[model samples]
Each structure stands twice: as structure tokens, then as C-alpha cells.
Target chain A: ERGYVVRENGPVYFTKDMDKTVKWFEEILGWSGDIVARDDEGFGDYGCVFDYPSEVAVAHPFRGFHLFKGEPIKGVAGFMMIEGIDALHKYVKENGWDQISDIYTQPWGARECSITTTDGCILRFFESI
Target chain B: ERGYVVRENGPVYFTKDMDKTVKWFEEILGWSGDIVARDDEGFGDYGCVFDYPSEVAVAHPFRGFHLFKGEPIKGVAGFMMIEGIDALHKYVKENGWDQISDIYTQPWGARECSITTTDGCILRFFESI
Candidate 1:
């Protein structure tokens, strides 16, 4: 490979408010790392990291995190392969995040659910069965 | 590993129209595998696969493609690490896909560009410098 391609790094969501967006991911999903500015302190500037095993860092890029810019009208989207879908869904509900749809098995055989973040990004998490 | 988590699979964009969205990915960008229905044949049910090098399938899932559902207010989000950012950008432009953002280097050291698909999904592709 010419290094021209790599694993998808997810999306860099452009938001109108950074603090609100950052705080939402932090409170709802559990930030795996600090919520730093793009150039202020740490690694990536616009977004924060998510909770994932550090051992398989080579499995994906962006450490499974998202970067948000303080612009753009619409929210972003993405998916995750998670362990216990039900437990996590319950956790999100109890924490006051909006659960747009109930957990259901997809035609592809992955059990999935969707959650709408504060900025309107609907992210789906699934477990392949 | 307990198989609880894998890398993020980007987003499964819920679209208002599946055919338009799938065709955009096929014609505008490039489809790697057949545009099989999620249950029709090859793999996943909804999405058509994309053009990532097959060797690094270990690096990411969905083979770097997207799954689209035919009903949603917004589009999906995600990024890709590409080799020749300029060539790809030019290709997209020449192909007439809407280039929303001019290719620019991000503070994180990636040369990035943004495009808005017909279904209102904005996907960003980058090459880390």
C-alpha cells in the first residue's frame, strides 16, 4: 500500500458550540481522555476520546473518538461495536440522554440502537451476533 | 479481549432515500465491492461496501464502506486516511460531487477535504502528514 489509505477515522463533526458538544460526549458516553482544544494542550484539537480498550489501538484510528468544530448546522453520525448493548442503552437513558430508537436486531444480524446527542448527532452502537 | 468492543464503525446514515445515497457512493466516490443489499447476497444488509485496501481489513470493519437507511433528517459522518489527498479531491471535483470544503491542512497534521453527498451526508477524507 502507498499509505494513501487507512482505516476510517470516523467524522470530524462541525458544531456551532464546542463546549456544549464536548460536555455532552463527556457526560453521556464517558470520555476516555481529556476534552482539550485542538491546539491548546493535547493531541487532536476539536474533539474528545471515547471509552475503548487501549490494547487494540491498532484496530482503529482516532482512538474511537470524535472531533467537533464550532460551526455547521447539522450533527454527525457513526457506529460502534459494543459488548453489552442493553446495559449501555440503559445507562444512556438513566443519564438523561435521548434514546431515539429502541434496540433491535438488524437484517445484517448486528443488534443495534440509536442515541441522539445534544448537537443532534444520532450515533448507533451494535454487537454482531 | 472479551470481544466487548472493536474500533468504531463510523456511522450508519439513515437516509430519506436509499437508492440515491447508495448510487452517490458508487458513482461519486468509488465502491469497492458489489452494491449488494444487506440481505441479498455478500454482506451487510443496507449498505454497499467502499474502496479501502482489503489487506487492512483488520484495521477497520465495514471495510470502510457505509450503510444507508432510507429515512432520516440528516446524513452520516466519518473520516478516512488517504494517500494522495489532492488527486482524490480533484477526482471528486471532476466527478461533480459537491466539494463543500477546500482541501486544507488541519492543526492535527492531516491534509483534509470535505464533501456533501446528495443525501446531505458530509464525509471527510484526509491523509495524515
Candidate 2:
């Protein structure tokens, strides 16, 4: 292997308002968000360094996303492997997060729920059976 | 911590033709793709388990994507960290892969290049400077 790709990081979600999006991820998902880069006018151009908890913290610690200040592109961002699904669901409900679905087992086998972010990105959280 | 999120898996890219998309990732990106799940008619429904080489292979071994058979969503999928930018660029050109941009340093400091996949997903490959 030539080592062209070292590892997979999180998605670069585009958002119309960086501050609002950053706040949403931070408050709802419990991820830390930082405005890493700014444009010439001092507005945040590249909001990044959002960190998340990972099972593979020792090897691949970073798990989160970068926010490019732009028009939102809506779709399924990705599936995140998770534990304590019920508790997480409860947390989301209590926190008033935009959860689109309730916890349910997919035909393919996994208890999953989803939240549609303000930018319209669908993040599916699942627990392995 | 509640351990809601264990880790971030790769993006779930939707493709109109699963077989064609699978072949593209396997051949062009050097990642191995598999049709993990199928529809009621047994056609590939969830083409997944595409594995990629990673620096954190020991702890976070799986670093790839799952291709969902559907209408393609166009946007910046994510940023992948790579080791050799120039070699990867050369490989992309020679292999007839969709190399969108030449390797260039970002203002914030990272040598990067991009590829627009068959599904119109922009995958930015970068090497930290």
C-alpha cells in the first residue's frame, strides 16, 4: 500500500449560518465545536475541530466534523455507531433536538434513530444488536 | 459519559447504480467494496464494508464507506487524511480517476486535492503541512 489514505475523518457539512450550526452540534450531540478558520472579513469561513467520543480513541481519536459556511446540502451524512441508545434518545427528546425518528430496529438488524440537523443533514445513530 | 457515540464510520453515499459505484471506489480509490445487504428482489440494497488503509488500523481498523442504492446526493462528502499527495495525484491521473483539482496548499496550511465521484460527491484528500 502506498498509504494514500491514512484514515477517514467526519463529514464536511455545509451550513448557511456557522454559529447556529456549531451551537446545535455542541448543545445537542455533546460534541465540542471550534471556529478554526476565518475569512478576510473575520467571519468564520471554516468552522471545524468538532470532537466526539470514540471507541478507538487510542488510535483514531478524532471523530467529528468541519462546517463550511455555505449553502446547505441535505442528505444522509453518515451512520454513527453508538451505545446507550435509549438514554441518547431520551437525551435528545429532553434537549429538544430535531430527532426525526424514534428508536426502532432496522430489518438489517440494529436499533437506530435519526436527527435532521438545521442544515438538513440526516445523522443516523445506531446500536449493534 | 453515557457513551452514546462509539465512533464515526464513513459516509453513506447514495448511488443510482450500486455495482458501478462499488467498482469505481474499489478500482479508483484502492478501497475494497462489498454488497453487504440486498433488497427484497436480492439486488444489492446496501453495498458496504469498503475498507481503506489507515494509520490507526490497530484501534480503528475500519475506515471506508457504505453505498446506499438510491438517488445520488451531490456535495462535499468529507476530507480524508492521506500520506502521499503527489503520488496519489499521479496515481489518480494515470488510473483515469476523476481528479478534480491539482494538489494545492490551503490558506490554513494543508496540501490538498479533490475528486468528484460518479455520484457527484466531492472527496477532498489532504496531507498535513
Candidate 3:
């Protein structure tokens, strides 16, 4: 399919502060971005708007991260989905923000770990753990 | 810090049909599962439950994909975020499920392409796309 429409216009974003949260959501999560909107004399950012299929039109200033695990929205305990979490331990030691967890079996079969984000958001990622 | 409690109790779910949607979500997305609850009759299965961080506790039989680019739930045009969508072309030609596209400039500067899922879901992954 040619690129289809979107809902939130971007990905769930986290930042140093929630007020500026929308900015991170647009540029990072969506991976698609444009100049901030301009008002009247072109002062102030009009910000961004997500499009069709999202089920919502009004874009919020973005003050929080929605928690989710299945849909791309709702933002449940997010971190990168990796093929190997062990290699991540070494990778994060040298370059951090990426979480490195002591591998342990969950109630499920996953062996995973939780790590802190640039915004201090704690996200758990997994491979075997 | 250690793991804390959650709300929704799990991930978004999709299934061959809506009724089993929760099943897809727990096993694939959350990577968490436990024994199905024993019903009063102890004959039929009680299925599973998503917990804590999800926000809402009432689980549904499941129906459709929630569309979103943020959150991680509400399923807005969900797809794997790939480090490379180009190499995916060759990979899918042999391995499959991975999507690759003819690179093109977006409204922004990056380029990207979309791929179809086993369940007919389309996910677009890109590097500069």
C-alpha cells in the first residue's frame, strides 16, 4: 500500500518535561516531522496533527505517555524489541539509555530487563528475558 | 529500581478473529502468559488477563486493531521499527514478513516503505525514510 493515514500523527514521546512532550513524540516516535505550525503573524508553533485512521483528530499538548503493549498507541511499558537481550548488556555498558537487564524468566517465557530513558522514563525491553 | 504494579494488565490483542484477539496480544506483544483460568465447570478454559500498566482492567474478547502511531496500543498502522528497511527486501525475498520499498523522500527528509503482515497488517519501517 502507498503510505496510509495515521491517527496520533506520531509515536508516544517522553522528554525531560511533559509540556514539551509533544515535540519528542513528533520527531522521534513518528519518525516523520515538519516545521512546527505557525500562527497569525507566524508566531508560535501550530505544532503537529496526526491524521486519518487514528480515531482522533485533536492533538493534545502531550503531557504523558500512554501505556500499552499491543497497539502502537496506548504506550505500554515500551523499550526496543531486541533479538538478543544479552548482547544488550554489553552494548549498554558502553552506550547507555538502552536498558540492560539481568536476564530472568517472567511470568511469561520472556527473559528481560528494565532500563532508564533519557527522560528518566523506566522502560523494560526483552529478548529471552 | 524494581518492577512496580500496572493497570490495563496487558497488551493490545489481535486474532484470526476478534474473540481470540487477547490471545494474540498476550503471547506476541506482551510476551507474557500463564495457565488459562479454570472455569466453574472446570471443563472450558477461562483464557488470560493483561495487568497493571495497561490503564483499563476489563478485557474484551477482542475485535480489531487499534490504529495509532504513538502509545503502543490503539494500534495505529503498527509495524516493526527496523534499523534497515532496505536490507529487508532481500531478507523477505528469502525469509519473509519483513517489508522493503523503493526509497522516496517524505514531506520531511527521510525515506521509507511499507510491508504486509501475516495477518494482513501493513507496517512501514525506514532508516532515513
Candidate 4:
């Protein structure tokens, strides 16, 4: 597979504060594993529509975080299946980002890594090996 | 499909700081949508081993977050293919979590919801519908 697509346009995330939330999402979406990482616009979600200086706000904002074990407070994350695992790792190193785990293989054999973006969203990219 | 499985255990995460880090993941892991949410020890990673009453630190500590639009600094997240979406949602509700998005259907026809845990990890759960 070239890449994994969630729903076509990508998954929609409803954040508590879009003002700051969308900007974070934008940065996360902009991080490209694809070769076209240079000139690509992020996916379209309510954030884009909200960014438009027309109409009114469509959704309400809420607050929350990632649930650890069982406790819930605040956080966000997503997953992507990339065809080029090592290549993207090169892009990550050559490009730049807070690399958590190096492009390593999992126990089950997926070449993947975890990363943190500007907005504090943890994205994990997995490649089938 | 019943559910999604990543390796035999689960995804392994490398955190920058362990003192305050593993606690977050522990809570997130315990916040289960599975009916067995009541009894889960969470996944095993270096954190667990590191937390053990031992005399050695095995792995190196690292830092990072979800790379948004390619920018990384600090954040994290993950995904799981849930077998029962609505059922899990009910568990989320009756139970507790930093609920971000209610269980809803996506444009592509899959049912999903986003939530944050106490440790700040955003988890998005999807069900094939």
C-alpha cells in the first residue's frame, strides 16, 4: 500500500479549543511521510472550515486528554501506515522533529516510530515488514 | 471483526522522562473500552521493566510527541480497531474518560470517537461499520 487512508479525507478531531487545536492539527497533518512533504496542504476538517472568515462556528469546543490505563485528563494522537518506513525516517532525521523512538521494528515486526509535533499530538507511523 | 491487535502485547513507547511518564501511560492503558476494562495490567514496555525493583536501567530515555504537519517536539497518541464501537462508547460513558468526541460515524462510514487520558495521550477508536 502507498499509504493508509482514514475515511478518505482523514479522521476528524473535535477539540476543546479550535483556535489552538486546529493550528496543532495543521502542523501534525503537514508532517509528511510522503515525498510530497514539501508543497502539500494539510487535510480539510472543521478546522479549515472554521478558519474560513465567513459564516459562524459549527461545533462546540470541549476539553479532555488521553486516558492512561484508566485515568482521563488531556492529550491527542493518531496512526498512519506508510509504505516507505526507512525513507520517511530519513526524511524525519534530515527534515527535523522530536524523534521519540528511532525507526525500529516492533516485536511483531512493524518498522515504526513515535513522534511529537508542535501541538503536542503524538503520531506513530507503522510500516508493514 | 472482533478487535485489532498490534503484536502479541501492544505498541511500545519510549518516553523522555520516566518518573512522570509511565504513570500517564499506565492510566491511559487502564481506561479500556473493552468489557474487561476492570482488569487490565496494561502493556509491557521498557517502563514496566524500568519500574521493576532492579539494579539497572536497560534502555535510554528519549523525548518526542505526535509530529504535526512534520513538526515534532512533544506529544503522543495511538489507534485500535475496536470490535464494538457503541458498546465501547457506553463503557466510556458509564465508566469515565476525558471525553473529547462522542462515538460518532465518519464520512467514510466507520464509527469512531476521540478521547484524552489523564497523561495527555489522545486515543481515537474506530469500528468497521
Task: Specify the highest-TM-score model's number.
Answer: 2
Predicted candidate 3 versus true structure: per-residue lDDT over B1-129, tens digit per residue:
012111111122222332233443343233123324334644223243232223332442211133212222222333233344445455454443334346555664455666544344444445544
Once fitted onto the true fold, the runs of candidate 4 whose alpha carbons sit more than 4 angstroms away are A1-129, B1-45, B48-76, B98-100
* DockQ, candidate no. 4: 0.04
**B1-129: candidate 2 lDDT, tens digit per residue:** 244655555556788778788887777767667787777877788866344543344355345676787777666776777788887787767778755698899876789988998778788888889
Question: What is the lDDT of every predicted structure here?
Answer: 0.60, 0.71, 0.36, 0.40
Whichever of 3 and 4 has more lDDT, that candidate is 4
TM-scores of the models, in the order given = 0.65, 0.85, 0.30, 0.32
> Which run of 10 residues does model 2 chain A get worst, by summed lDDT?
A49-58
lDDT of 1 by residue, B31-63 (tens): 443334654543334654456543444354554
Stretches of candidate 1 exceeding 4 Å from the true structure:
A1-3, A14-16, A36-45, A53-60, A63-65, A70-76, A90-108, B1-7, B14-17, B33-45, B53-60, B70-78, B90-108, B116-121
Off by over 4 Å in 3: A1-11, A17-76, A96-100, B1-129
lDDT of 2 by residue, A1-129 (tens): 343655556556787778778777777766667777777776677865344533343345355666788887666776778778888877667677755688899887789988888778888888879
Between candidates 3 and 4, the TM-score winner = 4
Better of 2 and 4 by lDDT: 2
